[model samples]
Structure formats: structure tokens, C-alpha cells
Target: PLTNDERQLMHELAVQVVCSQTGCSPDAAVEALESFAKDGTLILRGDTENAYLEAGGNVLVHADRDWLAFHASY
Candidate 1:
């Protein structure tokens, strides 16, 4: 089973990842994920972070996640 401390650490990392990719604050990221997509899930393409940056350059929902990459629209 996962320990509370490790779980907390993962949660912290996940928050940073989500917020960074979405270009939102931590609170905004959390709420949008709850309202928009599920945790640990994404709908990105391009298979690289560089692609996402090229697409939107730190705007919101630029990519599903860092590694997941981004596009302006579906």
C-alpha cells in the first residue's frame, strides 16, 4: 500500500505538473481537472513537451500534460 507521506509527495508533484502544463495556479489546475479531465488522464498528442510549447507557449490547456504535448484545438 502507499504510505501517507509518499502519497502526499506524489500529490504535490502532480499539482505542480498540472499547473505548469495548464498555465494556471494550483487551485485553478485542481478545479479544472475536476471539472475538465480526470486525474492521471490526458488527451494530448505530439508526444513531446516542445510541441505543446510551440502550439500555445504556456497558455491554459496547452497540453494535457508536459510529456503529453499540446495543440490549439482538437
Candidate 2:
């Protein structure tokens, strides 16, 4: 399980990635990501097992080696 700080960092990283991908500002990305998380559209796993399965086998296997980041725009 991730500590609160770890989860916070991951959340930030996820927001940044979304910003980079969608050309949104970091603030907007963070808001969107938070909304997704709250609504269960984006699930955060403590390990790769569930994430991999949830991704339908599309996740990068080695992503766990570093801070994981992702984003989506509605």
C-alpha cells in the first residue's frame, strides 16, 4: 500500500502526464484526474497486478519501476 505522501506524488505525476498529453495546464489536469479518481473511472492500484488487468493488458509492464503517470481528457 502507498503512504499518503506516495499517493500524493503519484496523483501529481498523473496530472502532469495528462497535461503533457492533452495540452492542458497542470491545474486542469489535476482537477480532471481527481474527478476521475472520485468517480471510479480511474483506479489507482498499489501494485501492478490490478493495474495491468484493469488496463486490459495494455499497461507498460515496467512502469512500476518509476513513478507512474497518466492522464485523460473528457
Candidate 3:
């Protein structure tokens, strides 16, 4: 399990990735991410996992290397 700070970092990274990929504002990306979470579509993946968001789908994966490393430590 992640601490509150770690979880916060994870979400921030997720939002950043979403912003870069979709070219959306940070706020809008956050809203979209939250909606995805509400719909049970948020995900986290390591190096080997699939791209759930790249296929025009509802899935959102946090595949950032920093996030992956942080998660792996726990």
C-alpha cells in the first residue's frame, strides 16, 4: 500500500502523462482522470503492461518510470 504522499505523487504523474498525451489542460486532465476513476477505468502498469488509454478506450494507465519504480519499492 502507498502512503498518502506517494499516492499523491502517483496521481500527479498520471495527470501529467494524460496532459502530454491528450494535449489537454491540467485541470481538464484531472477531471477526465477522476471521471475515469469513478467509472473504474483507472489503471497502473509496469514496463510490460498494455496501453489501455492509447486505443481510444476508457482505461488510464500510469506507466511512468518514476511511478513504476516507486510502486516496485513497496
Candidate 4:
């Protein structure tokens, strides 16, 4: 499980990834994930996994497939 701050950080990173890859507005991506985060149902991708790990966070592999989704803590 992630601390609230860590989850928010992950949400931000997810937004950045979406914006960078899909040309979506960062603000829009942030808004969508913020809502998901508030509900505790946000799922992050494997690429986001690398970003979080590279940022010095640790994540447990909760689900793995074409993309990885994990629980992380700061």
C-alpha cells in the first residue's frame, strides 16, 4: 500500500506519461487520475513503474501483464 503522498505522486507521474504519449493535456490527465486516486482505484502502467523506480520508490508487483501495476511506498 502507498502512503497518500506517494499515491498522489504516482498519479502525477501517470498524468505525465499519458500527456507525453497520447498528446492529452497534462491538466486533463491529472484531473482524471486525481478522481481515480481519490477512489483508490487507479491502475498504473509498466512504463510508469520504471519512472517510479527510477525516482527511488519501491513498488510491489501487484499485477503483471502487458503492463505492470504495483503498490508503492516512499
Worst 10 residues of 2 by lDDT: 52-61
Question: By descending TM-score, how would the candidates be arranged?
Answer: 2, 3, 4, 1
Better of 1 and 3 by TM-score: 3
TM-score of each: 0.42, 0.59, 0.58, 0.44
Report the lDDT tens digits of candidate 1 across residue range 1-74.
Answer: 33344334434555677777778899985675454445434222333232221112232333334333122212
The Cα error of candidate 1 at residue 15, in Å, is: 0.5
lDDT at 44 for candidate 2? 46
Deviation in Å, model 3, residue 50 alpha carbon: 16
lDDT scores in order:
0.42, 0.50, 0.60, 0.49
Model 4, span 1-74: residue lDDT tens: 44465545556666677687679998886675566657665554344324331221223222322122333431
Give the TM-score (vs. native) of candidate 2: 0.59
| CA-RMSD of model 3 | 5.0
Give the per-residue lDDT of model 3 (tens digit) for 1-74.
34455456667776778899999999998898788767766654334432223213544444555554566466
lDDT of 4: 0.49
Candidate 1 versus the native: TM-score?
A: 0.42
Q: Lowest-lDDT window of 10 residues in candidate 3?
A: 46-55
